[PDB]
Every structure is written in structure tokens, then in C-alpha cells.
Amino acid sequence: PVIKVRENEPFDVALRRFKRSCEKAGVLAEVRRREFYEKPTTERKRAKASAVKRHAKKLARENARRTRLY
Amino acid sequence: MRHYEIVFMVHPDQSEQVPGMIERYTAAITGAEGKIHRLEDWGRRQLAYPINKLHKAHYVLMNVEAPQEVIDELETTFRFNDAVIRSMVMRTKHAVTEASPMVK
Amino acid sequence: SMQDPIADMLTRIRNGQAANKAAVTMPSSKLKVAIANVLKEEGFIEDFKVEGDTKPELELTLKYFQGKAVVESIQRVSRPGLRIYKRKDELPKVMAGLGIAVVSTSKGVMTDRAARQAGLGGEIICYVA
Amino acid sequence: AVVKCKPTSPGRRHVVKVVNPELHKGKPFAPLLEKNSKSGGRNNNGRITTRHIGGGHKQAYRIVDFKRNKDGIPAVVERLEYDPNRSANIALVLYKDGERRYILAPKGLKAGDQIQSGVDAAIKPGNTLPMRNIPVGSTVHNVEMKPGKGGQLARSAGTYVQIVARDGAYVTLRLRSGEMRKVEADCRATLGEVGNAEHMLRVLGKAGAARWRGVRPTVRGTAMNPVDHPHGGGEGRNFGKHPVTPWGVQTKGKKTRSNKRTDKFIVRRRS
Amino acid sequence: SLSTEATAKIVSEFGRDANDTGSTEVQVALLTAQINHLQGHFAEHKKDHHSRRGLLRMVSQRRKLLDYLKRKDVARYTQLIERLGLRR
Amino acid sequence: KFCRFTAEGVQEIDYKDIATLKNYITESGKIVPSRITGTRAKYQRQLARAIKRARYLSLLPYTDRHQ
RNA sequence: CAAGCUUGAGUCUCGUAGAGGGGGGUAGAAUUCCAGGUGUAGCGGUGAAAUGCGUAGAGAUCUGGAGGAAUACCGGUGGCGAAGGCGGCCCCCUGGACGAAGACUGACGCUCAGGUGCGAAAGCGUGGGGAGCAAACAGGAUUAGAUACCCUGGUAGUCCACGCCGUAAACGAUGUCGACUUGGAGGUUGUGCCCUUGAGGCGUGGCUUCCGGAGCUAACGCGUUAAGUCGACCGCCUGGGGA
Numbered sequence: 012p013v014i015k016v017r018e019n020e021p022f023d024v025a026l027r028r029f030k031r032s033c034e035k036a037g038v039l040a041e042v043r044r045r046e047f048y049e050k051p052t053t054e055r056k057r058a059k060a061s062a063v064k065r066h067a068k069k070l071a072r073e074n075a076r077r078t079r080l081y
Numbered sequence: 082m083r084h085y086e087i088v089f090m091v092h093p094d095q096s097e098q099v100p101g102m103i104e105r106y107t108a109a110i111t112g113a114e115g116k117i118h119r120l121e122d123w124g125r126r127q128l129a130y131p132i133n134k135l136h137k138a139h140y141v142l143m144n145v146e147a148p149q150e151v152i153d154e155l156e157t158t159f160r161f162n163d164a165v166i167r168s169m170v171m172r173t174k175h176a177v178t179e180a181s182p183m184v185k
Numbered sequence: 186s187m188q189d190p191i192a193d194m195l196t197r198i199r200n201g202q203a204a205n206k207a208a209v210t211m212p213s214s215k216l217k218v219a220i221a222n223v224l225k226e227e228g229f230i231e232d233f234k235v236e237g238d239t240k241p242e243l244e245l246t247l248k249y250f251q252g253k254a255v256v257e258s259i260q261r262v263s264r265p266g267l268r269i270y271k272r273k274d275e276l277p278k279v280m281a282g283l284g285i286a287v288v289s290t291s292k293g294v295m296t297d298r299a300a301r302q303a304g305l306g307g308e309i310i311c312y313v314a
Numbered sequence: 315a316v317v318k319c320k321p322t323s324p325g326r327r328h329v330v331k332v333v334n335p336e337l338h339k340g341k342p343f344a345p346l347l348e349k350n351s352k353s354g355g356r357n358n359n360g361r362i363t364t365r366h367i368g369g370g371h372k373q374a375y376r377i378v379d380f381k382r383n384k385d386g387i388p389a390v391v392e393r394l395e396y397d398p399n400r401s402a403n404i405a406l407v408l409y410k411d412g413e414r415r416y417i418l419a420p421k422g423l424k425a426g427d428q429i430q431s432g433v434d435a436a437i438k439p440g441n442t443l444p445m446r447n448i449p450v451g452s453t454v455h456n457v458e459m460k461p462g463k464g465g466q467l468a469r470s471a472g473t474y475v476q477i478v479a480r481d482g483a484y485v486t487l488r489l490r491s492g493e494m495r496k497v498e499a500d501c502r503a504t505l506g507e508v509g510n511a512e513h514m515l516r517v518l519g520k521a522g523a524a525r526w527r528g529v530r531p532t533v534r535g536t537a538m539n540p541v542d543h544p545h546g547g548g549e550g551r552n553f554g555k556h557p558v559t560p561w562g563v564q565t566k567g568k569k570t571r572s573n574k575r576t577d578k579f580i581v582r583r584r585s
Numbered sequence: 586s587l588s589t590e591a592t593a594k595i596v597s598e599f600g601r602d603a604n605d606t607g608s609t610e611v612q613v614a615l616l617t618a619q620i621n622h623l624q625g626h627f628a629e630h631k632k633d634h635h636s637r638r639g640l641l642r643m644v645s646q647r648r649k650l651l652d653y654l655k656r657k658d659v660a661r662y663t664q665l666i667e668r669l670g671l672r673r
Numbered sequence: 674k675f676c677r678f679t680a681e682g683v684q685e686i687d688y689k690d691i692a693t694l695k696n697y698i699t700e701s702g703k704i705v706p707s708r709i710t711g712t713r714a715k716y717q718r719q720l721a722r723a724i725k726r727a728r729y730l731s732l733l734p735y736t737d738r739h740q
Numbered sequence: 741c742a743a744g745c746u747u748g749a750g751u752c753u754c755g756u757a758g759a760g761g762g763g764g765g766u767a768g769a770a771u772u773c774c775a776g777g778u779g780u781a782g783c784g785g786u787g788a789a790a791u792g793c794g795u796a797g798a799g800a801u802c803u804g805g806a807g808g809a810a811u812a813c814c815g816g817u818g819g820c821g822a823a824g825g826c827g828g829c830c831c832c833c834u835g836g837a838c839g840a841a842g843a844c845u846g847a848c849g850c851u852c853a854g855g856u857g858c859g860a861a862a863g864c865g866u867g868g869g870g871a872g873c874a875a876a877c878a879g880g881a882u883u884a885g886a887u888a889c890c891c892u893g894g895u896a897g898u899c900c901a902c903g904c905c906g907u908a909a910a911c912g913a914u915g916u917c918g919a920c921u922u923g924g925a926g927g928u929u930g931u932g933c934c935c936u937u938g939a940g941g942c943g944u945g946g947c948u949u950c951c952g953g954a955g956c957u958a959a960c961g962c963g964u965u966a967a968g969u970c971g972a973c974c975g976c977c978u979g980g981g982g983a
């Protein structure tokens with residue numbers, strides 16, 4: 012991403028904008044999974060393990076609204 | 082027979098033979114009994130990423146209702162032609178004559 | 186593939202009794218009507234009726250006595266692939282006379298007790314208790 | 315197609331015969347045929363310059379056209395014939411005027427096809443036009459070395475040359491050996507590969523099938539005598555020297571190239 | 586997948602009222618036409634096993650229809666056989 | 674949010690449109706996921722194809738950097 | 741055995757979704773090499789180092805070119821397929837699946853020993869190719885010892901065509917087909933109707949996901965896609981080792 016800083020802009024805010032752009036692009040987070048070979052078996056296992064937790068959280072959110080006042 | 086939505090980008094320098102090649106393609110389609118649909122020229126739009134070390138080509142689009150034989154004939158002509166840079170050919174569900182979003 | 190209509194009828198009535206249903210509509214047949222007549226005569230069901238011109242449908246009404254279903258166990262005996270033919274001497278007795286062991290023979294399908302009374306055997310159709 | 319036969323006899327047990335039902339079952343074209351005299355490895359001085367040559371079967375010569383100078387005139391192909399002077403087949407070609415010639419048969423060719431030559435020919439297997447007009451990346455065969463000389467590159471049963479560059483007046487080509495070479499742009503080439511692409515699949519089966527082709531048995535230096543060969547001699551199967559030719563030249567590894575006149579055309583040595 | 590015109594022509598040729606469109610003659614005719622069309626397709630793509638299961642299913646259905654027609658009334662079975670050049 | 678294609682009754686999506694299609698690609702040339710766009714699975718699979726067609730025809734860059 | 745019916749089965753007509761299969765092309769990132777221009781004492785790697793790569797210009801960057809694989813985001817308990825399994829894009833052939841309203845043959849239906857075909861990867865033969873990864877193998881490191889887990893190389897193989905085996909925790913450890921049995925919250929796909937002013941509202945089929953009642957089970961758990969009650973068929977089980 013091009014983060015060419017214009018005039019009258021502090022280096023601090025310029026670097027923060029660059030870091031935010033990198034974070035929203037998610038380039039740094041992709042190397043931690045592209046650094047090694049994940050077998051298709053392992054990838055599918057991770058995907059289902061993440062899907063199971065992803066609606067289990069919503070299931071618990073919608074189920075904890077019945078009892079347990081505080 | 083089938084409907085296609087052919088489009089191609091040609092070299093910007095030798096962009097004066099585009100009308101001639103368009104006329105030749107239309108003549109071939111008509112001799113092959115193809116009902117030519119809309120035909121537009123988008124000018125020379127700057128390429129998003131350069132192709133063969135040039136940053137701008139000339140866009141030509143045409144919808145053609147022609148048999149697959151002459152369609153393959155046109156594809157081979159595009160492949161063997163030197164002036165044309167790239168060619169996109171895709172089948173269409175039905176004949177379309179509405180104006181393209183580029184010309185709006 | 187529906188290869189046994191009698192078993193389908195027994196399954197439907199048994200599931201209706203379990204689910205506390207009121208009426209169990211099904212595609213009827215000559216043998217289904219003959220069996221429903223026996224059920225009405227023996228009091229195990231409440232009512233049976235054939236309503237249909239081109240595709241006759243039997244709509245049996247379930248009978249309940251103080252919550253408990255009247256029919257305790259419904260069992261097919263002579264299923265297609267294993268046919269049972271017993272003479273008059275060896276006609277079955279269900280629940281020591283408290284249940285019916287319906288028998289089909291030449292003189293229609295009346296019941297096991299009526300078959301024994303008339304002195305003719307036949308083939309066992311349904312055990313209803 | 316390759317056809318294996320039953321082991322009815324030693325010699326038929328281990329032989330397969332690659333056949334072709336499209337080959338002409340008859341006689342060749344007399345006006346285009348000449349006399350092919352076998353030398354047996356002998357030169358004008360009577361010495362044996364090349365060993366393991368002699369005998370075989372009587373063969374004739376077919377005049378095969380490699381220059382392809384007939385520009386602007388199309389032609390059809392009549393049939394295919396087996397050429398005993400090479401590994402591939404020869405296509406008989408009849409021109410519009412009435413000429414008959416023998417051309418190298420491309421892989422994608424059959425009786426009834428039509429081919430032409432010149433600077434306006436179409437890009438299909440069988441035509442011939444200059445490499446300058448031939449697009450980059452093409453796989454051609456029967457490539458020239460000099461303009462109008464004829465044809466010497468990729469003329470075997472299953473050989474083809476691949477064009478990769480058109481830098482100025484010269485073009486770059488990869489040959490079957492894996493070597494890059496520069497040739498003049500005005501040179502001619504025939505599109506596509508060669509016909510008999512499965513020639514290498516054949517096996518002779520017996521020494522008789524080799525004697526039919528006419529290559530004499532090869533004697534081993536280690537089985538020879540010291541006077542006859544450097545490897546000869548010993549009280550048994552012995553060897554105490556590096557493998558060398560009968561004339562002393564090292565065989566395995568020692569390159570024997572000394573031509574420095576055509577070193578400007580060799581882009582990269584074969585590997 | 587025969588074309589609409591091809592299916593209509595077969596229906597008109599084989600159905601008595603040109604509106605039958607599903608008897609043990611017109612169905613077998615369509616199956617035979619599809620099998621004959623796919624003969625060259627599979628001879629070209631000899632390794633199209635996924636599309637071959639459909640052809641096998643069509644062959645089985647045609648065999649069942651022919652057996653049923655022969656068991657029911659074998660005069661139209663024989664007539665359909667020589668009309669379509671059926672081997673058996 | 675909501676599927677604007679269904680809201681406006683857009684039956685088909687064409688790669689030739691760029692002004693109303695750039696809204697579905699990030700600044701890095703990546704496709705905005707459905708969980709952020711608010712688009713149905715019927716039109717996400719057609720938007721992806723249109724974006725791929727535009728990338729092939731040099732209408733939308735694959736990424737910010739190419740050379 | 742004969743004569744009838746469509747409710748089982750199947751066909752045609754209009755449409756829909758899909759990484760379904762086969763064949764051929766093309767774009768792009770990236771990795772590795774080849775050559776050149778800047779470029780100076782380090783690079784790589786690990787828990788720690790070393791084998792390894794460097795002043796013969798290593799590592800870094802740029803330019804130009806060569807080659808192989810798959811297609812970042814889309815991407816989801818999303819979709820298809822009998823199973824195995826399929827993911828840039830385009831072109832050609834083609835299988836299968838689902839829906840409103842219809843028309844049509846008329847039990848043509850289910851299962852199936854023996855048989856036939858398909859069938860992950862690994863493996864074998866021939867002909868090609870080979871960028872990266874990587875059995876065997878070498879070296880370095882740890883350990884009392886390490887023929888291994890940590891590292892540097894690295895061949896077969898993984899990539900293509902034609903051939904052979906029918907092997908997997910080939911799993912949903914749940915065979916194929918038909919009917920019935922409380923409910924809730926979704927995903928995907930089609931159609932009908934109402935004023936569609938906004939994915940407004942009511943219905944209606946196919947696939948699929950999570951809870952959950954009766955019931956079942958030794959219990960975990962199944963629970964309308966049942967492991968709840970039955971019907972038709974095939975295959976398999978009879979103590980653990982031996983095997």
C-alpha cells in the first residue's frame with residue numbers, strides 16, 4: 012500500500028497510518044501461516060474446529076440469557 | 082448460433098488499423114452468417130497494470146451471434162495477430178444490445 | 186419400495202397411538218378394510234371409514250381409555266417372505282384370550298376365536314393386544 | 315502403433331514391430347528415385363574409416379526436398395512412404411502446376427491435406443515461411459543454418475526445434491539436444507514436429523535385425539589383444555587403464571570440440 | 586442431452602398420437618439416440634468415467650424397458666429392434 | 674448491511690462496470706469479504722467472477738504493486 | 741392367466757444452482773536459476789551453535805530472459821459428486837441434481853451371492869519433464885548412547901501421456917429402498933401470492949448445520965437426515981492370542 016505522506020503531517024501519525032494500513036491489509040498475519048506447509052487434512056481440521064467454536068460462542072450468547080442473573 | 086461478447090485490447094501506437102481490422106472481422110462474420118450485435122470502441126484506456134512494458138492499450142468490444150467455427154476462426158486470428166495485445170471471448174446467455182457502462 | 190400394506194397400516198396405527206393422535210389417514214385396501222372391520226368388532230379401535238372414489242383412503246379414529254391406549258401391542262405375523270399357516274388345532278391364542286390373533290381363511294377374516302368356533306384354520310395376520 | 319509378438323522362437327520372443335497402416339503398400343515414385351551405393355565404411359583410399367559398417371539390405375534413394383522454394387503455389391499430399399535412408403517417413407506432395415516432390419512428414423499430417431510455402435503461407439504444420447514471419451515460441455522442424463542453403467536441423471523421426479527470441483536480424487533456438495543457438499532470421503523452417511514420433515520404441519529382437527540394417531558386431535577392447543587395442547591383454551578379465559578410443563583419445567568426459575569459427579552462434583552449450 | 590428439435594422428431598416418429606412422449610418405444614428410441622451420440626464422445630474422451638455412469642444408467646433403463654416390453658407384448662419389441670438396429 | 678444488488682434488482686453483474694464495482698475491492702486489490710460487504714452468496718460468487726474478469730482484462734489491478 | 745388405474749417408477753416442455761468429468765489455451769503473484777548494472781563483510785540457521793554460503797564480490801536492490809506447480813482475497817460445518825474426490829479465467833463436448841403449471845406408458849418397482857465398472861495416496865513399466873518440497877543418503881547439532889525428532893544439502897517421488905494393484909481410521913467406525921412419529925434457531929437453491937415504497941409479509945419443495953420432546957441404548961449418545969416402530973434384500977459376527 013502507498014502511504015505517501017503529504018506536507019504538514021507528523022511522522023508519528025504517518026507511521027501510525029502506515030501501520031493501520033498494514034493491519035487492515037493483513038500481510039504480516041499471512042506469513043505465520045505461509046511459513047510452513049499445512050496438509051489439507053490439517054487445514055480442514057482447523058477450519059471445522061474454528062467453525063465449531065464460532066457458533067458455539069453465539070449459541071452460548073443466546074443460551075445464557077435465560078438464567079444466571081449475575 | 083451462439084452469442085459471444087468478444088473484446089480485445091490492441092497496441093496504442095499502431096491503433097489506426099483498428100477500424101480496418103474491425104471491418105475485416107465484421108466482413109468475415111457476415112460471410113459466415115453471423116448476426117453482429119453492438120460494437121463499441123472505448124478509446125485508449127490506461128491499463129491498470131502494464132502489459133508487455135506498455136501502460137495503455139486500446140479497448141474494442143463487440144457482441145457477435147456467430148457459429149463456433151468462425152468464433153474459433155476469430156480467436157486464432159487474434160492469437161496470430163501482432164498488433165492486438167489481449168483478447169477476451171466469453172459466451173452469453175442471450176443476445177444483448179444495451180450500451181456498455183463505459184460509454185454510459 | 187412399499188412391499189407390505191398391512192405392515193404400513195400397523196406401523197401407522199401404532200405410531201398414532203404413541204403420539205396420541207386422533208385420526209390416522211392412509212391409502213386403504215380391501216384387506217385393510219377387512220382388518221378394520223375386525224378391529225371395530227373387537228373394540229380395539231373406535232371407528233373406521235373409507236372416504237374416496239378413485240383413491241380410497243381409510244381414516245381410522247384412535248381409541249383412548251383414561252389416557253392409556255386401548256391397543257397395547259400390534260404385531261405382524263405372516264410378513265411377506267415368511268408365511269405362517271396353522272390348522273384349527275394349532276391356532277394361536279394371544280394373551281390367554283385377552284388379545285386377538287386374527288386369522289384369514291375361506292369364510293372371510295373374522296377372528297381367531299370365530300375361526301376356532303367354525304372349525305377351520307387359516308393364516309395368521311395380526312396379533313393385537 | 316507398437317505391436318508385440320508371441321515368443322514362438324528366440325528372436326521373436328523379444329522383438330516388437332512399430333507399424334503404420336497409412337504407409338503406401340506398393341512401389342515408390344521412379345522419377346524421384348536415384349541409386350544409393352553403399353561404401354561399407356570404405357573411402358577412396360580403401361581403408362575402413364568407420365568401423366561396424368558393411369552388409370545389410372539393398373536400398374534406394376528418394377529425392378527429398380528441403381529448400382522449399384515453391385513460393386505462392388499451394389499443393390496437396392497424396393500419401394506417405396517408408397524411406398529406408400532415414401528414420402522418418404516421406405510425404406509425396408503434388409503441386410498445382412503438376413510437380414511431384416518428397417517432403418518430411420509432419421506429425422499432424424495425413425492423405426488429402428494441403429500445404430504451401432512462401433512469405434504468405436499460413437501457420438499450420440506442413441507450411442514453410444521465414445523465421446522472421448514465424449511467431450516467437452513456435453515449434454518447427456527442418457530448420458536452415460544459412461538462407462537458401464536447404465535444411466539440416468531437426469530432420470529425424472521425432473525431432474523439433476523451439477524458437478525463443480527474435481533479437482534483431484538473428485533468432486534464438488533450442489534444439490533437441492538442449493542447446494541454444496542463433497540463426498539468421500531469413501532462414502526457413504517447417505511448422506510442427508515430425509511424423510514417426512515413436513521410432514525409438516522399436517527393439518530389434520536379434521542380431522539378425524541389426525545385420526539387416528547393416529551394422530557389424532562391435533568387438534570389445536578388453537577382449538582384444540594389446541597390439542590391436544590398448545585395453546587388450548591379460549590372463550583374464552582385467553583392466554588397469556582409463557577407457558580410451560583405439561587411437562588413444564579419452565572417451566568418457568573428454569570433450570572433442572575445436573571449431574572456433576561458429577562460437578558466436580552458440581548461445582549456451584548443451585547440458 | 587438431445588436437442589429439443591431432435592426429441593420432438595423422435596416423439597413424432599415413434600409415438601402413435603405424436604403426444605405419447607414416454608412409452609416403451611419412444612423412450613427406448615431416445616435412449617438409443619443418446620447412446621449412439623455418446624459413442625463418439627466417449628471414443629474421443631475414453632477417460633470420462635464420471636460422464637460414463639449416466640450412459641450406463643441409460644443402458645440399464647433401456648434394457649429394463651426392452652425386457653418389460655418383451656414380457657408384455659412382443660410384436661412392438663421386435664418392430665422397435667429392427668427399426669433401431671438393436672443387437673438384442 | 675443489505676445486498677444492494679437485490680435491493681436495486683440487479684439481475685447480473687458485468688465486469689465492464691468499474692465505477693460502481695471499485696467499492697467491492699480493498700485498496701490492496703483484495704476482495705471485501707461477504708461478512709463485511711453484506712452481500713448474499715448468490716451475488717458474491719458473481720462479483721468474484723466479475724472482479725477476476727476485470728483483473729484479467731486490466732480493468733482492476735490484482736494488487737497495488739505489480740512491477 | 742386375463743382385463744383395468746396412477747398413488748410407485750420413468751419421459752417430454754420451460755427454468756435454476758454448482759471447485760461434477762474430460763481436452764485445449766491465457767493472465768498474475770511468488771520461488772529457483774542465467775547475464776548484466778550499483779553494491780561491501782558478512783548471509784543463512786537454531787533453545788545454543790555448527791555443517792552450509794562469502795573479498796574468486798556472498799547477503800540487498802534493479803534490469804532482461806528461462807523453467808515447473810497451483811491459483812493470494814473470494815472462502816463459509818458455502819457447492820457438487822454414487823464413493824474416492826473436486827477451487828484464477830476462457831473456450832468445446834458432456835454427466836448428474838432441483839422448481840411452479842402441465843401432458844404421457846402403466847407396476848415397467850426394491851435388493852442382489854456369483855460377476856462388471858469406478859475408486860485417496862503410496863508403489864511398478866515405458867516415454868517426457870523437473871521450480872519448490874521431499875523417503876533413501878551425507879554432513880552438522882542434542883544425548884551415556886540417537887541408525888530420529890533441531891539445521892544445511894540432497895536422489896527416487898510429488899508435475900504429463902499410456903499401462904498394473906484394488907490397498908486406507910476409503911469414517912457418519914451407522915449397508916440399499918418405502919411409510920409414520922413433538923418442536924426451535926439457521927445456511928444454500930427455486931417457485932406462488934399480497935400494495936415488495938428497504939432481503940416488507942404469508943406460504944410452498946430439494947440439500948445441508950446445531951440444540952431438543954417421546955422413544956431407544958450398557959451408557960456415551962441418536963433423536964424427522966434416528967441409533968424411535970415396522971416392511972423387502974444382501975454382507976458380516978460367535979472368547980483373547982495363534983492369525
Ligand SMILES: [Mg+2]
Nearest residue numbers: 530531532533
Ligand atoms: Mg553394442
Ligand SMILES: [Mg+2]
Nearest residue numbers: 540541543544
Ligand atoms: Mg599400447
Ligand SMILES: [Mg+2]
Nearest residue numbers: 549550551552
Ligand atoms: Mg584374475
Ligand SMILES: [Mg+2]
Nearest residue numbers: 547548549550
Ligand atoms: Mg585374455
Ligand SMILES: [Mg+2]
Nearest residue numbers: 551552553554
Ligand atoms: Mg586389480
Ligand SMILES: [Mg+2]
Nearest residue numbers: 861862863898
Ligand atoms: Mg501416485
Ligand SMILES: [Mg+2]
Nearest residue numbers: 874891893894
Ligand atoms: Mg530435511
Ligand SMILES: [Mg+2]
Nearest residue numbers: 878879880881
Ligand atoms: Mg545425522
Ligand SMILES: [Mg+2]
Nearest residue numbers: 909910911913
Ligand atoms: Mg468400515
Ligand SMILES: [Mg+2]
Nearest residue numbers: 850851852916
Ligand atoms: Mg442398487
Ligand SMILES: [Mg+2]
Nearest residue numbers: 951952962963
Ligand atoms: Mg440432538
